[PDB]
TrEMBL record, chain G:
Protein's cellular compartments: Virion
Name of the protein: Capsid
Annotated family: Belongs to the parvoviridae capsid protein family.
From TrEMBL, chain H:
Annotated protein name in UniProt: Capsid
Residues the record lists as binding Mg(2+) 1: 34
Intracellular or extracellular location(s): Virion
Organism this protein belongs to: Adeno-associated virus - 4
From-to range in the entire protein, with total length: 246 to 306 of 734
Similarity-based family: Belongs to the parvoviridae capsid protein family.
Length: 521, 123, 61, 61, 61, 32, 61, 61, 61
């Protein structure tokens, strides 16, 4: 009822053998969006052209690791386990409070509206465009004490061509009121359980072996290969002779191998040092999107980012590329920056053990056929798809990164591991929608068929609990020497990091991946 | 039926080429009163997709929300190439810059084909 | 005369698949610097890369 | 000479969309025709006038 | 103020025609539209653009 | 009672063989 | 369901609305058809076509 | 066919080069959708279903 | 063509090779492809070479 709480606060984590359960509770605030309306969106902006609808609904997003793990819990996870994956999820929305806002001569006053409801439903059949996996804001804040605003639900429709936002007969419009939903007054609560499909464990380890060094460095191969086609050390000089050799130690680059580095697409490398880059504007015919690796879908350019899993530059190197995820640093509050130091660069350098380098190339190959009179040019293999015998590691997941992505509803897909990182799921955690039910204001006393457009101003607030059961696999290495471990090593600090400062503001100072432990190939 | 073709100039067959005699198989012999029947089951195959997509692969995001991911916006000030002041301009990826949003998926494989006009004099 | 023939189309595939007469995209011809602007190379052919999705062509009556 | 019968059992999956607005549908829309299409003509010859794919309905990604 | 729910069970009879050629079908065929029809516009107003009867299918006498 | 909703929102349609059920929910306002 | 009775009060400036938890509304169905039937006169007052629209209950006369 | 004989086929034609055999046998082909669906049936299929696949087949001569 | 075993113009340079962390690794044998006959006058890294019956050393011309 009114004077009885419909749920309690729960924010712990229980570790067991092969399992860990996270529990997170936060307070949310839901305003009335679009003034209770559905607005048709759309704008012709060349490669940025889009169309769709903004809805009056809000939705819950739990798609970031820091929503579920405290920094210390993340450390417990990554320093001791080789793998992890989500198993189950339970969500609760309770302690609903609908507030009525009234304006007067001076300030505005808020009051409880005990009879008003909010509507809530989970799109458990995936009938609505899924947007919880687009690397966007709106997830539960990392800090348990923070109160967040429920994000407004909106979706994009089919864009035809690369110049007009105009919709065709294929474009769909989805009305969310057209779905069944629970109506909740201040005493009611909402709950939903979900199970994850079996997904592979994320690999929480860096490789301690290189793909091109899997042989016994003490033994020769029983395989032979061409060593040279002339005597000497000079090109186009010496005596022509087919010099063959048994492949033996210290000539590892020429050993016959069973496996190849995974697929790759060359990205453009930029320096964190301004004057080290070519001057390329943000807009115009020569905008940056042009000089950045990009895919073309229906004439529209889409920057390749982060792109396929590739080895990148170290997080502290002077260079970076679109293959690297960049987060706002602890002192970054705006939405633009000219100083890279205010941002947090992630890195996939551990991938150099099996994956090709993002700003380099997969390799080289002949530009033609050689002969005693023709030396072919050495062509660059800047892009290469799946070839039999290739192996690769997916990119890493981050503490402040996404957890899952919905695998697109298509006939074909190659290695459905979301490129921003995480778990590709056919049936991901369902989107949960919430909306403040409209309450008509004082009506006219004469009938009118015109739809009511006068409403009492309201907003709701409540709590949301999310519990995730995770399956983990402990590292079982036989390595003798100490491993690398994520450790607090900031030294002397005026204000303890990973903690609210003197003013009470909580910020995340660094990006934490999951690859400290190692594993051989 | 066609057999193995070796090279790209001669139809000559090699020892690998096969000859199949169909009389070498058992067959039913039918006179005017006889009939022939056969049943077959299909292996499980995926459903053919009888629908066009009402969403674009590069527009799977909520058009109202910013990304918590950042990206390089430009390397100079202004609108001209090789002009302006060198500066690493970064930006939070937000609405109306959808082409630069970080995405989880890519368009499928492809091989460029040659385009011809149905209008003769245009080729 | 093409009018005497029936042309089919896979235009609905523009939602996830690349265009047949265009290209999959573009990539740098080299490494850029304060003195070198790489050429914009065309990706006219590209095989399976992790994260790709696509729809098969349509069946006809 | 003789007869041949072929029977195929097909499994189909009905569309279960939540789309509010009308979908595109394959429809007979040839207008006025001296001789009904998809039907034998005056001389008795049967011909197929158009190619019909299977993608009229839509689905989100 | 409050809510009102109305549920109607309808009995329908599927067409069982032996007609060989394609039937006329109600189809979304408005072409390119700045604002999708049968959907709220940019300002959020919902309007019905056309009257839709029920007689697309045919039946002989 | 006061702080407990007396019903939920329902707006779907279920199609079957020879039958279809429509369900529609709307918000109304009644003046004097 | 979800009946909410509001009490309106006017003051020097704007008017204010407040919940009246003890007020009632009366409802009955003329199941025996003892009253003039007007729901079948091609008149306004029916539930709006759009699920998100809020409508005014028509006055009986 | 072939006057009851098996003839060894083959012709050197660069990229069109081929070899094989023509047999005195004929064969049945059911590999086209219009062999099984009338145009109206195809319309019933494509306007109402998201997916289809063959399940079983029976042939009689 | 005369290509030395070592130096800036060594054979590894003119042979198809993959690059892992900056290091070259000759593509060999590489992905399954049709090669030259075992008795042809040409060969490539796609072919496995074993020491013949009279080969006891670790080099041969
Ligand atoms: Mg967050
Ligand atoms: Mg689909
Ligand atoms: Mg109406």
């Amino acid at each position: 009822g009114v004077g009885n709480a419909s749920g309690d606060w729960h924010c712990d984590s229980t570790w067991s053998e092969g399992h860990v359960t996270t529990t997170s509770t936060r307070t949310w605030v839901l305003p009335t969006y679009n003034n209770h309306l559905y607005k048709r969106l759309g704008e012709s902006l060349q490669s940025n052209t889009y169309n769709g609808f903004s809805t009056p609904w809000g939705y819950f997003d739990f798609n970031r690791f820091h929503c579920h793990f405290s920094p210390r819990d993340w450390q417990r996870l990554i320093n001791n386990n080789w793998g992890m994956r989500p198993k189950a999820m339970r969500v609760k929305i309770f302690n609903i409070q609908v507030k009525e806002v009234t304006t007067s001569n001076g300030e505005t006053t808020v009051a409880n509206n005990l009879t008003s409801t909010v509507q809530i439903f989970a799109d458990s059949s995936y009938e609505l465009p899924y947007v919880m996996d687009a690397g966007q804001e709106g997830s539960l804040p990392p800090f348990p004490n923070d109160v967040f605003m429920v994000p407004q639900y909106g979706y994009c429709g089919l864009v035809t061509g690369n110049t007009s936002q105009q919709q065709t007969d294929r474009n769909a419009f989805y009305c969310l009121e057209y779905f069944p939903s629970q109506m909740l007054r201040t005493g009611n609560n909402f709950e939903i359980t979900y199970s994850f499909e079996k997904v592979p464990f994320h690999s929480m380890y860096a490789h301690s072996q290189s793909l091109d060094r899997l042989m016994n460095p003490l033994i020769d191969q029983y395989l032979w290969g061409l060593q040279s086609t002339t005597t000497g050390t000079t090109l186009n000089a010496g005596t022509a002779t087919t010099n063959f050799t048994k492949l033996r130690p210290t000539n590892f680059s020429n050993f016959k191998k069973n496996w190849l580095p995974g697929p790759s697409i060359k990205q453009q490398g930029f320096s964190k040092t301004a004057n080290q880059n070519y001057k390329i504007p943000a807009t115009g015919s020569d905008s940056l999107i042009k000089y950045e690796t990009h895919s073309t879908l229906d004439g529209r350019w889409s920057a390749l980012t982060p792109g396929p899993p590739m080895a990148t530059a170290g997080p502290a190197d002077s260079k970076f590329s679109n293959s690297q995820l960049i987060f706002a640093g602890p002192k970054q509050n705006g939405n633009t920056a000219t100083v890279p130091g205010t941002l947090i660069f992630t890195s996939e350098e551990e991938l150099a053990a099996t994956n090709a380098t993002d700003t380099d190339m997969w390799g080289n190959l002949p530009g033609g056929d050689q002969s005693n009179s023709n030396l072919p040019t050495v062509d660059r293999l800047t892009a290469l798809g799946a070839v039999p015998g290739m192996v690769w590691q997916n990119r890493d997941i981050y503490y402040q990164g996404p957890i899952w992505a919905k695998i697109p509803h298509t006939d074909g897909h190659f290695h459905p591991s979301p490129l921003i990182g995480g778990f590709g799921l056919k049936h991901p955690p369902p989107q949960i929608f919430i909306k403040n039910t409209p309450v008509p204001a004082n009506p006219a006393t004469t009938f009118s068929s015109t739809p009511v457009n006068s409403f009492i101003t309201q907003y709701s607030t409540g709590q949301v609990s999310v519990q995730i059961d995770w399956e983990i696999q402990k590292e079982r290495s036989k390595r003798w020497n100490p491993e690398v471990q994520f450790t607090s090593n900031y030294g002397q600090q005026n204000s303890l990091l990973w903690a609210p400062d003197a003013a009470g503001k909580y910020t995340e100072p660094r990006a934490i991946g999951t690859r400290y432990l190692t594993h051989h190939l």
